[PDB]
């Protein structure tokens, strides 16, 4: 399913970057998982992950790197601390299951 994220974002001088990752759902899912992967040299590592029941605030597993806020079908992420950062959205319930993969975000550090 179509996931939209910016092509490029700028990171502040304190190493924190913020971008919006929005997603549409063919149905209306009440149980969503949002993941952020880092892709460099074909291999991918997990930046962070959060589980989302719509309207109940975005709960992140481990807030060491990512803190984010929900507002409908948009998620405003914040990552702290030079590859490609991909926003992943999983519509778990109700069926059907949907996987969404954004086109990736480049992060330039001024």
């Amino acid at each position: 399913m179509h996931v939209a994220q910016p092509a490029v974002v700028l990171a502040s001088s304190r190493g924190i970057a913020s971008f919006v990752c929005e997603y549409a759902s063919p149905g209306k899912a009440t149980e969503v998982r949002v993941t952020v992967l880092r892709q460099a040299d074909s291999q991918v590592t997990e930046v962070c992950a959060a589980t989302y029941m719509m309207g109940n605030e975005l709960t992140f597993l481990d807030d060491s790197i990512c803190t984010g806020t929900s507002s409908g079908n948009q998620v405003n992420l914040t990552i702290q601390g030079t590859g490609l950062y991909i926003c992943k959205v999983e519509l778990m319930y109700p069926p059907p299951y949907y996987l969404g993969i954004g086109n990736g975000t480049q992060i330039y550090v001024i």
Partner: antibody
Framework: QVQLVESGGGVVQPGRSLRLSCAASGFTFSSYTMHWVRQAPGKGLEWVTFISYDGNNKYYADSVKGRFTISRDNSKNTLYLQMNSLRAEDTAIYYC???????????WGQGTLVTVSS | EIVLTQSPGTLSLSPGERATLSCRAS???????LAWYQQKPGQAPRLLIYGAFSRATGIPDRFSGSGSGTDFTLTISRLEPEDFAVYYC?????????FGQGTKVEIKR
């Protein structure tokens, strides 16, 4: 090195039950969704069932809906497949499969054979 | 249900030749949700291509993929003896996860 080893296959009569296991090693088990995929002899691949990271959500193919139950034990790095009310149409190789973080089934077990016949 | 469709049923080529395997989807599926698998007789499937174009780890460069929407392609630029096997495409963007019928690549003689 990612490893999937399934067990519990065997020969069984229609209506009976069989329990399969898939032992995973070489990766953080709870960080990946899992599938069972089956392959009848001489035919193609058919997806059977899917399970979430912790197990909150499970989905099944229509041919097994109501008779198969997928489960996992992240504490023991094991995946399960309780298959009841077996039919001859369930005769196949049952593969244990991991879902990659970008979608595909990136790792497969070597498979365990089940034969349902009267 | 997204029905996948492969062609041909059997490819008859010689070692060193170029193989082109087709996969068709009954409705449009994004490139990020298509994969190709190789299976040799008596062995479990093995991932080659994911995201239509990207190549799995440990897969030689002679394997590549292309296409979007309805029609997808797997290309083997130069067939090696170990490349003669069965190949399956799959969509993994939504449930149920569906596979194609498979395509057999045999040695022509």
């Amino acid at each position: 090195q990612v490893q999937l080893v399934e067990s519990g296959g065997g020969v069984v009569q229609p209506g009976r039950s069989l329990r399969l296991s898939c032992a995973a090693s070489g990766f953080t088990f709870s960080s990946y969704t899992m599938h069972w995929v089956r392959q009848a002899p001489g035919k193609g691949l058919e997806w059977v069932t899917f399970i979430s990271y912790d197990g909150n959500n499970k989905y099944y193919a229509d041919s097994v809906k109501g008779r198969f139950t997928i489960s996992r034990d992240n504490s023991k790095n094991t995946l399960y497949l309780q298959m009841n009310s077996l039919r001859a149409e369930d005769t196949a190789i049952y593969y244990c499969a991991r879902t990659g973080w970008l979608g595909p089934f990136d790792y497969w077990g070597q498979g365990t054979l089940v034969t349902v016949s009267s | 249900e997204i029905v996948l469709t492969q062609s041909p049923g059997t490819l008859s080529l010689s070692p060193g030749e170029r193989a082109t395997l087709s996969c068709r989807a009954s409705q449009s599926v994004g490139s990020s949700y298509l994969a190709w698998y190789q299976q040799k007789p008596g062995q479990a499937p093995r991932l080659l291509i994911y995201g239509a174009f990207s190549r799995a780890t440990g897969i030689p460069d002679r394997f590549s993929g292309s296409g979007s929407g309805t029609d997808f392609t797997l290309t083997i630029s130069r067939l090696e003896p170990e490349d003669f096997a069965v190949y399956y495409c799959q969509q993994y963007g939504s449930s149920p996860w569906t596979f194609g019928q498979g395509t057999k690549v045999e040695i022509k003689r």
